[PDB]
């Protein structure tokens, strides 16, 4: 589904992303915005047989398995289809694992280019969460 900005903020806060390994809630909301526009159904094909899935565009080459990607590593040990659910549980758990690597949120190019080092709290500011 397509989340409302505030609706996603509340959901992400509920799912423990606010202050997860130091990253404030706005960071994840902003990343969600630029990656898929709060759309859990968003998918994107890449030059390799890999595909990005969900509200946070998680790659099938490293993080999830769709049974049709060469060199799949399935780091999150999860079916990519689980990342398309209107239920963000799986996408969040996987994100938390990605950000647990030495590079943290730098895994998301869009976050680096349009969120990293900005007033990301602007993204949850206004919402009555």
């Amino acid at each position, epitope marked *: 589904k397509v989340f409302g900005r505030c609706e996603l903020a509340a959901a992400m806060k509920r799912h423990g992303l606010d*202050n*997860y*390994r130091g990253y404030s809630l706005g960071n994840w909301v902003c990343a969600a915005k630029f990656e898929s526009n709060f759309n859990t159904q968003a998918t994107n094909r890449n030059t390799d047989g890999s595909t990005d899935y969900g509200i946070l565009q998680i790659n099938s080459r490293w993080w999830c398995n769709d049974g049709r990607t060469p060199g799949s590593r399935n*780091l999150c*040990n999860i079916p990519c289809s689980a990342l398309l659910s209107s239920d963000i*549980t799986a996408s969040v*758990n996987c994100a*938390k694992k990605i950000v*647990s*690597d030495g590079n943290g949120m730098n895994a998301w190019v869009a976050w680096r280019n349009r969120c990293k080092g900005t007033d990301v709290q602007a993204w949850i500011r206004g919402c009555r969460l």
Partner: antibody
Amino acid sequence: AVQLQESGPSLVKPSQTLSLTCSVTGDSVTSDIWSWIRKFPGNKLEYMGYISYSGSTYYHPSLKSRISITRDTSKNQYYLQLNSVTTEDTATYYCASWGGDVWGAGTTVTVSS
Amino acid sequence: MDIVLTQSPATLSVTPGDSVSLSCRASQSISNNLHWYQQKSHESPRLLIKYASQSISGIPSRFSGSGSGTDFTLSINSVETEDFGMYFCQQSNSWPYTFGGGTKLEIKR
């Protein structure tokens, strides 16, 4: 099904180095984040640190300077190195996946002279 | 500073068939990043609940968790014969990850 198994000297002398090995079977060491957890007497658990799928590491600050975690991609194992041990390092050592879904049987390491 | 997790009571004696609630409290808010482990004697820890209340496929349904922030609870509806032993909570919200002191589930007689 992925399985883990710890191995190493069960006895280490004070001031010397503690070394353990965790053999990954069923999958690749590159297919997950792996960690070392120790249990001191009195049921006191300590998360020593972990090594990512990329080889990146995070160490418990209390152990920073004494600890080192590495892996070997061709043998599918990762290791723990703990220097300048003292009797206080005596404990049961376990290797586990980051997700906590898999654990080795654990192996006791005793520091004594 | 390192997050401290306090579990209570230290020990709990119960009769199989009874329900019990185990408490874990954090010195700081950790949202839903609290996990529950069971460790029986001579066995390594087994993950029962992840992220405060998510169930693990393969774990008996009598096990469930709740709470958020700094107050969490592990519930066991009708404790069973093979459920006795140590129960520990662990947070993964901040590094270093930390474990609580654990609660011992013992048999009442």
